[PDB]
Design a protein around this ligand. Sequence first.
Ligand code: M41
Ligand code: NAG
Ligand code: NA
Ligand code: NA
Lengths: 251, 11, 28
Amino acid sequence: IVEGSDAEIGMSPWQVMLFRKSPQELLCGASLISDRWVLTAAHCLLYPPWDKNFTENDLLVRIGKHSRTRYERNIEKISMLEKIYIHPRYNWRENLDRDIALMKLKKPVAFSDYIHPVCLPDRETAASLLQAGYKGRVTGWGNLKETGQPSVLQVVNLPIVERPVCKDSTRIRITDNMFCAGYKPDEGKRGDACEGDSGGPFVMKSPFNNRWYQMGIVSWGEGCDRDGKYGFYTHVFRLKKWIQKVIDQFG
Amino acid sequence: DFEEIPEEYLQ
Amino acid sequence: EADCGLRPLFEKKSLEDKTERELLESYI
Ligand SMILES: CC(C)[C@@H](NS(=O)(=O)Cc1ccccc1)C(=O)N1CCC[C@H]1C(=O)NCc1cc(Cl)ccc1CN
Ligand SMILES: *[C@@H]1O[C@H](CO)[C@@H](O)[C@H](O)[C@H]1NC(C)=O
Ligand code: NA
Ligand code: NA
């Protein structure tokens, strides 16, 4: 996260770290959506241009974390993966369209003060909140700048951007399965996700029921926090039917 | 630069 | 499930985090 701040303890209890077994390193962010399911970006698991194609046994999920590097004894919980599900129409070839994956844990994780699932949006909540100017929150342990790394989980609040501005900021083809967020050059404030934040959640707190909803998944951006560029997020609600089909079929 | 995790998670 | 999105150390205790007000103020 670029230009963010240290998270408060328990501020993002659904935050998940995807962790490579060997070498031991941060792979990506992710989120907890129930006691057995974790949501992330497909490109965290499959990305042929970088020779990335992880299998279940390559990875661990670490939940309840604050410190990036420490083993947080008695706080974090580490889970093995039963199965990875990548969207069948995930477009790694072109523009990361439908950049979404689910991971089922081998055993359920115990909720605690530091571990708790985020809500997924219904159509109504999505329609109410996914509006230009409305701010969401992005969290992760990714790099602090484009070209170092944080001691603890970072947080930044960012405004959703008008689709035409999103489209005009890039030569990449934008789809309805993406939205973008970030400040414009003129707005003074800044901030963005960066390398290593991929797969983490973009959340909004509903003013209707005071619950946190994951509206987006950190997906892509040209650089990190560049003037005139924006962060692009997987549109979680637009892909909810697939999410439900997977959980219903393999739950 | 990551602290080693309990071996049981790697087994 | 029914308890999703309510944080043990915040919503569950009626405590607010330092910047959630920024989000609310943007929901115009
Ligand atoms: C063009 C995208 C697709 C790519 N950009 S990139 O890695 O920074 C390469 C790059 C750098 C500078 C100018 C143009 C391109 C990208 O974002 N990728 C390629 C594979 C993984 C993903 C990524 O890094 N996602 C993390 C991310 C997510 C968000 Cl929302 C914002 C910034 C970033 C960091 N680039
Ligand atoms: C990635 O790995 C799987 C299984 O190891 C393989 O079958 C597949 O062809 C590989 N490439 C993909 C999914 O693009
Ligand atoms: Na364009
Ligand atoms: Na920018």
